[PDB]
Design a protein around this ligand. Structure first.
Ligand SMILES: Nc1ncnc2c1ncn2[C@@H]1O[C@H](COP(=O)(O)OP(=O)(O)NP(=O)(O)O)[C@@H](O)[C@H]1O
Ligand SMILES: Nc1ncnc2c1ncn2[C@@H]1O[C@H](COP(=O)(O)OP(=O)(O)NP(=O)(O)O)[C@@H](O)[C@H]1O
Ligand SMILES: [Mg+2]
Ligand SMILES: [Mg+2]
Lengths: 637, 637
């Protein structure tokens, strides 16, 4: 809350009054230009709004529209509030109210609370849910994880279809392509050899550009997952390279390596690494860990690839990350080993923010159905505690919300719908970790921010897990739960090798889960969000120093306050810069919260003058650390 | 025949001996690198070669391999003779012999003569036939005329599939796209408007690049046909423009206008021309002439487009042709009006060389099944005549050859196969017009080269027509012949408004055709070929002048001999340059031969300093002249 809150209330003035009418407007709307009935509300939902209009308008509390961050509102106005004809036809509460209804049909009770919590900034869904929830094509889902359906032209162009047919509504896409042959591999049609990936990519990077004015975003953030033994690996990690004068100016593709441990082994024990066109080495992206090392090992034996210094790739890879900050690294074995869907098959890729990790097949495209809970709004008392009951509580709710989405979602491609339906993956997220910390005035390093951390996720996983049981208790287990690690009482940390930090009763849980099942194969995918230092500001009053006599140190420096004349230790330990905090503490809290995460989540370790040898300790640290999504991003300068 | 014939016979030495063994080799061949059975002969054909090996090797006459033009052989060696492992495994005769067999199965008699004529350079098929005829994927067809299946993403990407799935084997492609909406037109999905064509094009221009190493050619000569009332017309004619810094560097697309007469009317009577996104103006590429002018006329009435100075387009168009030599012009109404397939629907486009003109639908892709007869090899006696019987004769044969191709062709896309099968379009071509003339020593202008001309086609059309009857006499009418102009005795010139030049009995013909039908809806598509002055050289001896005392005038000038010191009139009237000959005589002979051409064929009028006003008389001349393929190409400097 700053001095520009006028943009809220004075533009709470060009807004009409009663939810009901605003819906009417939106429902009844017409294309003032083509005279086309252009509704922005589904028949289905509209009637629900009319049938209840009374209790609804009543229910809303418009005073809550002032309880919004300055840059926050702007976001909504610019992009989330349904406009009428160029003009904003939605008070934030309306949006909320339409989202709330979006999710539950006749479940008005459910609608109303899942209303209130939202309005009381407790949690919020993903843009996709925000944007379309309630409207005629209620696509509320975030990303899609697409499988390169075949290594035939029929395949590629059937894949290319989706990557558009989705890309046209929807959100981010991440497709894995370990099965397309390598440069100069062999066509059994004619005298041709293979073009490779990179031109085939230039293709996908191109439907990307064109298919967009509808996907309501030129940003075509596609990410491409590929195992590092593919004979085309080098050209692949290179994509975004600042040079390439007839190449991929792939300003919207990003390359992600889907890395088995073998590679990281070879690398460390400085050795060999063999490459393959997949055609000569079949079945490779289908085995993993041991089954995979037997396999790969033997195609080396059998002499099918092109042996290189394992240290060569790793070396080039590194170079690329620095110059471009890509490829991303996800650990193939870390992920499958510790996935609850290991029963289905082999998870071949994760997604752009290298967060969700769920099965995909040429006839299953996986979805990111996600909401994210606002960690800071459970802080409670001058100095304070955190309400873990409230947490458990709210996160029980969201797990319900998200489940619904899975049923009321508008599916872009039949694949998507099969997938989401048999497996029911959710993704609870979280916002405000860094905050919560600073509010409870704990420094990022505290071996008690350390503590807090663990407990939080512990509680979320705990709740989501339980909520999911009851609905599986009410509605039946998700369709494919048998064979599940959970179908045998093995849980996230159990697959890591730990004991819960025990703040919740996992026995009673693990007990019922076997007895009732759960409504979803996965539950949480924490922190790769923004729209889905201000903290000093406050503190500097009580001690001293200020404004006219101090438009100085920080305007200059990046909120890096270590060693500033007249400023407390308590503070410059709390309000630590991100370069300033220890990475092996970040990697660490990471691998901590990691134990109660069905999915994965992403690191962005933040060093200064990173060495082809520093970066390496960082990757190997986390690597060795059991982590699922490797180091995902390194920011430099 | 020059002094380098050594490349034939001395490299007739690294060739093995008896056809049969050469087949064996080719049949039995293996991928010396992947150990894959890599045959180059179909089971089907192989056995035919063994079952008859005796009469076959015998039959061949290898002395004929010396009867080849210097640059000619090179063509074969470089690209037509099946290589073994990098090394040429085919004497020209073998190729021929495999082509010959390619076409007829057990029809050895047919094989053998259709052998001999070929070997006696009388006619030859299209590369596609040359290359693959006999081999396991006997795709022998030239182009494909593809229909933009829908104005949905499902459509576009289903079209894009073919334009690859074909493009991967096969030959040239020409697709028409009058149905895709215009820039900023309206998506009834969301807040998007249309990207337009040009980006959608950038898409097709891109599968073009990638899908090629198999299509055994980086050249992706796609041509795109579009009516000039499409709201995106301007950007469309611009494609190849030497400027466009985030545009189509469409180094392999070419834009062709599919122009109704209305436009050319408006233009001349200096007036208006309205543009449309097709969505607001539906049915437009489906009506023509009168039905079309009623339609279009009324969308003007109704005020649906964006009225421009008809003279504006025409003006821009022109500019484009000069700077790029495109768009090509085909006359939509000229073509449908005088098509024998008018019964099926509306021919929406022709093809790259703007020659064939046959129906296409989102479930019919039309084919160019073609061979071409060598006009010069019927000249017969010091000075001479032309044997029209031989012509009629040989061209009877080719019409048989080509028919077979239609049945033994390997079809890339089910569409192709339906089309070719129900309609049976052929394309007899011709080579050596310009020659024949000079051999019978007649000048391009002679009102008796004028005469000869007409008669030739008259005879070819006459023969092909008759040959086609008999097989329709033997095999039945092509599947869709009822409703045919011919199914009513109306023939090519009859649809023009003429009487045959009567050198053949058209009554007896027109008689039987109604009685038996014909095997093909179309027959001929003359002169847009090369691989499918040397004439002075000879003459300069008998009079005088030569070599050491004359490495002069022409080495310099473009065989333009008008006014050279000591050189006969007889000659410099015969060996006239192409800029030097009259265009309205070219346009004219054109519109002459035109009357006996089922299909179309193409002009390349050749002026010097062409004016936005000179070009115009040329287009309007031919236009008014009844022509089907407008002026197709203008070469300048
Ligand atoms: N004309 C072409 N241009 C580029 N790549 C091609 C072409 N034809 C096939 N490929 C490659 O071959 C793979 C797909 O196989 P496809 O072309 O559908 O079957 P095919 O290669 O003819 N037969 P096979 O080798 O038996 O699968 C892809 O990785 C393509 O790159
Ligand atoms: N996301 C998009 N980007 C670019 N063009 C699009 C997009 N969505 C639709 N189009 C255009 O719309 C036409 C195809 O229609 P399509 O998108 O399949 O159905 P739609 O527009 O959602 N519904 P409708 O308008 O009722 O056909 C093509 O000319 C496309 O350019
Ligand atoms: Mg294949
Ligand atoms: Mg549509």
């Amino acid at each position: 809350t700053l001095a520009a809150r006028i943009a809220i209330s004075n533009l709470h003035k060009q807004t009409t009054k009663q939810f009901s009418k605003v819906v009417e407007d939106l429902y009844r709307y017409v294309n003032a230009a083509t005279g086309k009935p252009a509704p922005m509300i589904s028949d289905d939902v509209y009637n629900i709004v009319m049938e209840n209009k009374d209790k609804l308008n009543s229910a809303i509390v418009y005073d809550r529209d002032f309880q919004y961050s300055y840059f926050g509102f702007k976001t909504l106005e610019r992009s989330y509030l349904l406009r009428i004809n160029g003009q904003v036809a939605e008070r934030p509460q309306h949006l909320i109210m339409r989202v709330a209804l979006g999710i539950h049909g006749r479940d008005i009770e459910a609608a109303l609370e899942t209303y209130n919590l939202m309005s009381l900034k407790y949690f919020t869904h993903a843009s996709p849910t925000l944007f379309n929830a309630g409207t005629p094509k209620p696509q509320m889902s975030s990303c899609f994880l697409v499988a390169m359906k075949e290594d035939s032209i029929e395949g590629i162009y059937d894949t290319l279809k989706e990557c558009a047919l989705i890309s046209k509504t929807a959100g981010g896409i991440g497709l894995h392509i370990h099965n397309i042959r390598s440069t100069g591999s062999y066509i059994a049609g004619t005298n041709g050899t293979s073009n490779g990936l990179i031109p085939m990519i230039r293709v996908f990077n191109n439907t990307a550009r064109y298919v967009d004015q509808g996907g309501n975003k030129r940003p075509g953030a596609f990410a491409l997952y590929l195992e590092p033994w593919h004979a085309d690996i080098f050209d692949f990690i290179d994509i975004r390279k600042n040079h390439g004068k007839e190449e991929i100016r792939a300003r919207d593709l990003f390359p992600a390596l889907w890395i088995p441990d073998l590679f990281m082994k070879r690398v460390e024990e400085n050795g060999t690494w063999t490459l393959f066109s997949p055609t000569s080495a079949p079945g490779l992206s289908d085995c993993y860990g041991d089954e995979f090392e037997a396999l790969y090992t033997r195609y080396e034996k059998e002499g099918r690839g092109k042996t290189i210094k394992a240290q060569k790739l790793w070396y080039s890879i590194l170079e690329a990350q620095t110059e471009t900050g890509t490829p991303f690294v996800v650990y193939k074995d870390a992920c499958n080993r510790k996935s609850n869907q290991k029963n289905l098959g082999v998870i071949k890729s994760s997604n752009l923010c290298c967060e969700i990790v769920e099965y995909s097949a040429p006839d299953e495209t996986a979805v990111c159905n996600l909401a994210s809970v606002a960690l800071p709004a459970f802080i409670e008392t001058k100095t304070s505690t955190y309400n873990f009951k409230k947490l458990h509580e709210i996160a029980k709710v969201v797990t319900r919300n998200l489940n619904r989405v899975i049923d009321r979602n508008y599916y872009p491609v039949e694949e998507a719908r099969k997938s989401n339906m048999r497996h029911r993956p959710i993704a609870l997220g979280v916002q405000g970790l860094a905050d919560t910390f600073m509010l409870l005035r704990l420094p990022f390093d505290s071996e008690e921010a350390r503590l807090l951390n663990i407990q939080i996720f512990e509680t979320i996983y705990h709740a989501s897990m339980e909520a999911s049981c009851e609905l599986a208790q009410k509605d039946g287990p998700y369709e494919t739960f048998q064979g599940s690690p959970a179908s045998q009482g093995i849980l996230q940390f159990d697959m890591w090798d730990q004991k819960p930090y025990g703040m919740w009763d996992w026995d009673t849980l693990r007990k019922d889960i076997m007895k009732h099942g759960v409504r979803n194969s996965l539950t949480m995918a924490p922190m790769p969000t923004a729209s889905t230092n201000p903290y000093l500001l406050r503190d500097l009053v009580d001690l001293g120093i200020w404004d006219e006599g101090m438009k100085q140190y920080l305007i200059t420096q990046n909120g890096s306050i270590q060693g500033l004349p007249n400023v407390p230790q308590e503070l410059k330990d709390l309000y630590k810069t991100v370069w300033e905090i220890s990475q092996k503490t970040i990697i660490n809290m990471a691998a901590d919260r990691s134990v109660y995460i069905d999915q994965s989540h992403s690191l962005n370790l933040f060093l200064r003058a990173p060495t082809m040898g520093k970066l390496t300790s960082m990757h190997f640290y986390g690597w060795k650390k059991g982590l699922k999504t490797g180091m995902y991003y390194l920011r430099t300068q």
